[PDB]
């Protein structure tokens, strides 16, 4: 009866009745930051419900050939409520955060998806081809907001290292058989305190199937999968002008 | 001690004179008892009651369980020989096999393996069932001992082998034989073949033979050393007693044909029920 | 949460999500004959682990108008790995045994099996159809071996003994709407304390279909039904050159 | 493990494996009259088993476009067994009820009944449809036996009174994807200790069907619903001949 | 006695005059524990 679960932060609730377990990134809880860790001198703001709320994004569609899909956090969150809005105003912010990935099916389908966090995704290109461009991704790829991007070479995940290995980072996995959703609760993970919402991304979420959905024809052929996401401790300093980007 | 992994019944029984007494039971409703509902796959009996089904009265009852007891069911004496002097030359050597007759041969094949001692009784007249003075010697041959071979044969001084000497107008003779088994009890059933070697079709007859039940061979003769005008029927007939019995067996359901096999008439298979028309019609 | 079970005895292990209990012949575990029961005085051997270990014998196919099979025991194992050896090598063997039988369909399949084992089955002929003739079952009927036999008049169970008081036995039922496998422990059963391996059967396994198979067509029609059996407390005496029948 | 429920009173028992709790109608369970509310003074019979028992009735079909059932309590057992024969010989009848509602479909099925207890259901009419006629119902609508009417205006309950309000009266559920059974324990409800068993009902069940019943063509398209009753404390007094109506 | 079987609610009231008080409540994450699902 640990198939069930509620997840209550602000004024926002998801419940599921097949799930796994709760995955808490490295085994840490996110927190505030401490007086011994900071050194910005001027006080920060803690929102406290308004920010720390449930989130949700637009909806994918799986196919029978899908690639898979990346976000990059917290770009996801910056033009979204009054998370958007703090993270505008000021210069710095920190907080942790709470991944929750929906995918359900009938009884009659099959398929996998692995659902991991990786820290510091940066991308590369495939070198126009034959290795001897030095190509950079474009500005709507590193960051493609709150709708996401889809993977190119999903088997090097566009950045030259192998999917096989991915489950070295936090991860879980959504079998169409046994669960319909994954949770995983990562914190700030950063070699500075504090950093900007607009330069600089944390961690990417990656959503990949790895055995291919597959149905027979007469059952619902529309299988959509849905991000919904928390930020947990928000804290926000250098309150200045709204700067968008 | 340098090596570490060097160092290294679910059932009582009870004594049950009686029945069991019924309790008084009431009404019950409620969620998540039900006695009633029961999975027959686990391979156990039910265990669903009287009180848990309906509503019971309260039943002291005395039915006593002593006659189901094994040694009450067996302590009967049944037919197990036929033996006639019509074998012209007034001797009958007879190989003991107790499976002749199919009355006791159904009740002992209820089980697997039994201990037993026996006790034999000797009824002997002739073939109309007349009685007349005429003097006669059973004898019981051992395996191994010589056989006789004729009504003035050495074997007759029996000066090892048990002999009983009776009249035909006396009464019956009775004797207690032992659990004479080389092994731990009596197995009707034997699965299997009692020698070594290749087992080609012309030596099938060996499958199923224990030598752990062959006990030799019955003699009778009429005693003097000239011919008797008189017929011989001798019928045989044992009680069993101070018994045990291990694994119940299904009790066989065709009519039996040869002594030493569970051979059975395969054009005429009985069903096991006598059979209806309908089955919603009784 | 009983329906779970693992099964681990040597280097072996068997894993079932769909079971009942696990049935003790006649409430008694396997064990080594004790000093006052044992007759040979010779010091026998046990192997331990190269013995006590499960063995999957070859697979039946469940069909619509299957009528049962039988195996007998040890004979299934005379030729089976180093207790196939140590049977041939002594002239003495003893013995008990965990019967495990697999069967698995779909939620749109049905039927029962009944999973019986009868010690001392002792085979019987159709005496030539007419009853006079006093024929005699080949060797090739008596011992199967491994293969196993399939059984010609099911409802009499080929020895003049109906199926339906059959259930008197140590028995477990394959029912396919509630379980997929059936485990019964049968300890050592004779008259005598050791016996032949190659000479003496002590019990006959029954896997008799109660209930026919039925499904739709369009569904899995290929149903098999595997057996897999280990010995549990073998001893071997009486040594000598390896003698195979 | 509350799902399985068993109920047992008399010589008879209802089982079932898919059920939801069981309502005590106000609270309250079933009792006999005290002799501070007892106004009559004659000694009253208690047959107590053969009175006190399950009974079933006849059996309805729902349809894809069924209106809803009534019946009419205890109208519905004072022709059937020792119960309506008390109820003939004797003036004065007193008890409480255990109804209990059946209907059975497959995983593939869809469809939610209301059972509810209400009591003083009296029925109106259309008042000739255009409201003119004083009308009234007949013998056979106000009480129908144990076989049961079909409602005609099932949104307002052939009374005037609305269903979506029926939830406040004593009720269950049967909804074909949760419990296939319903269960009410009601107790005497009346403004005298004791009334007429064949001039008074006490309560109507009603068994309205509120999201319609929907398969695909090849299911089993009859999907039946039984009633099965049982009295609780059954009190008679005022013995005379047996009068039918 | 030699006959053996011839030997054989709910919610209480209270006082209410005021309606009820809203305790402070924090966020919960976790597994087991579902207030929000029902059983109508
Ligand atoms: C003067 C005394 C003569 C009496 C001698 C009787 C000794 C024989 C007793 C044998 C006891 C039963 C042994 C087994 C009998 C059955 O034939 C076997 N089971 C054959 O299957």
Redesign the pocket.
């Known amino acids: 009866s640990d198939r069930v679960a509620q997840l209550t932060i602000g004024n926002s609730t998801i419940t599921t009745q097949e799930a796994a377990n709760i995955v808490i990134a490295y085994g840490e809880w996110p927190e505030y930051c401490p007086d011994t860790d900071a050194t910005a001198v001027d006080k920060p703001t803690r929102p406290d419900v308004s920010v720390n709320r449930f989130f949700t994004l637009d909806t994918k569609s799986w196919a029978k050939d899908s690639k898979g899909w990346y976000w990059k956090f917290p770009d996801v969150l910056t033009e979204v409520g009054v998370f958007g809005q703090n993270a505008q105003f000021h210069y710095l912010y920190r907080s942790g955060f709470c991944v929750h990935v929906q995918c359900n099916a009938s009884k009659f389908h099959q398929g996998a998806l692995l659902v991991a966090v990786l820290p510091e995704y940066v991308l590369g290109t495939i070198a126009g081809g034959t290795g001897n461009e030095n190509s950079h991704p474009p500005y709507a790829t590193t960051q493609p907001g709150q709708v996401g991007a889809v993977l190119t070479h999903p088997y090097v995940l566009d950045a030259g290292i192998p999917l096989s290995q991915l489950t070295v980072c936090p991860h879980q996995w959504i079998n169409l058989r046994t669960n319909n959703c994954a949770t995983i609760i990562v914190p700030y993970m950063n070699t500075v305190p504090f950093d900007s919402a607009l330069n600089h991304c944390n961690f990417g979420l990656l959503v990949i199937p790895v055995v291919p959905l597959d149905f027979n024809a007469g059952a619902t052929s529309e299988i959509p999968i849905t991000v919904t996401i928390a930020p947990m401790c928000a804290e926000f300093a250098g309150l200045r002008q709204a700067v968008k980007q | 001690d340098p090596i570490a992994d060097m160092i290294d019944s679910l059932t009582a029984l009870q004594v049950l004179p009686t029945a069991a007494n019924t309790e008084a039971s009431s009404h019950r409703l409620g969620t998540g008892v039900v006695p009633a509902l029961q999975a027959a796959e686990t391979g156990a009996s039910s265990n669903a009651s009287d009180k848990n089904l309906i509503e019971t009265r309260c039943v002291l009852n005395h039915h006593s369980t002593q006659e189901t007891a094994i040694g009450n069911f067996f302590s009967r004496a049944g037919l197990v020989s036929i033996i006639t002097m019509p074998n012209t030359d007034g001797y009958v050597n007879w190989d003991?096999?107790?499976?002749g007759y199919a009355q006791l041969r159904r009740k002992?094949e209820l089980f697997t393996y039994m201990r037993f001692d026996?006790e034999?009784t000797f009824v002997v007249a002739k073939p109309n069932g007349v009685l007349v003075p005429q003097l006669l010697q059973?004898?019981?041959v051992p395996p191994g001992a010589p056989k006789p071979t004729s009504r003035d044969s050495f074997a007759w001084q029996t000066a090892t082998n048990?002999?009983?000497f009776v009249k035909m107008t006396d009464p019956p003779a009775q004797?207690s034989?032992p659990?004479?088994?080389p092994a731990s009890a009596?197995?009707?059933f034997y699965d299997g073949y009692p020698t070594f070697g290749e087992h080609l079709q012309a030596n099938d007859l060996d499958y199923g033979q224990?030598p752990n039940?062959?006990?030799?061979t019955?003699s009778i003769r009429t005693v003097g050393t000239e011919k008797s005008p008189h017929s011989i029927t001798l019928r045989v007939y044992?009680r069993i007693k101070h018994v045990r019995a291990w694994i119940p067996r299904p009790l066989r359901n065709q009519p039996y044909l040869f002594?030493?096999n569970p051979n059975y008439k395969g054009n005429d298979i009985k069903c096991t029920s006598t059979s209806r028309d309908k089955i919603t019609t009784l």
Chains 1, 3, 4 share one sequence.
């Open positions: 003991i096999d107790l499976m002992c026996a034999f059973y004898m019981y048990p002999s009983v004797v034989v659990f004479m088994s009596y197995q009707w224990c039940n062959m006990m030799g019955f044992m002594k030493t």
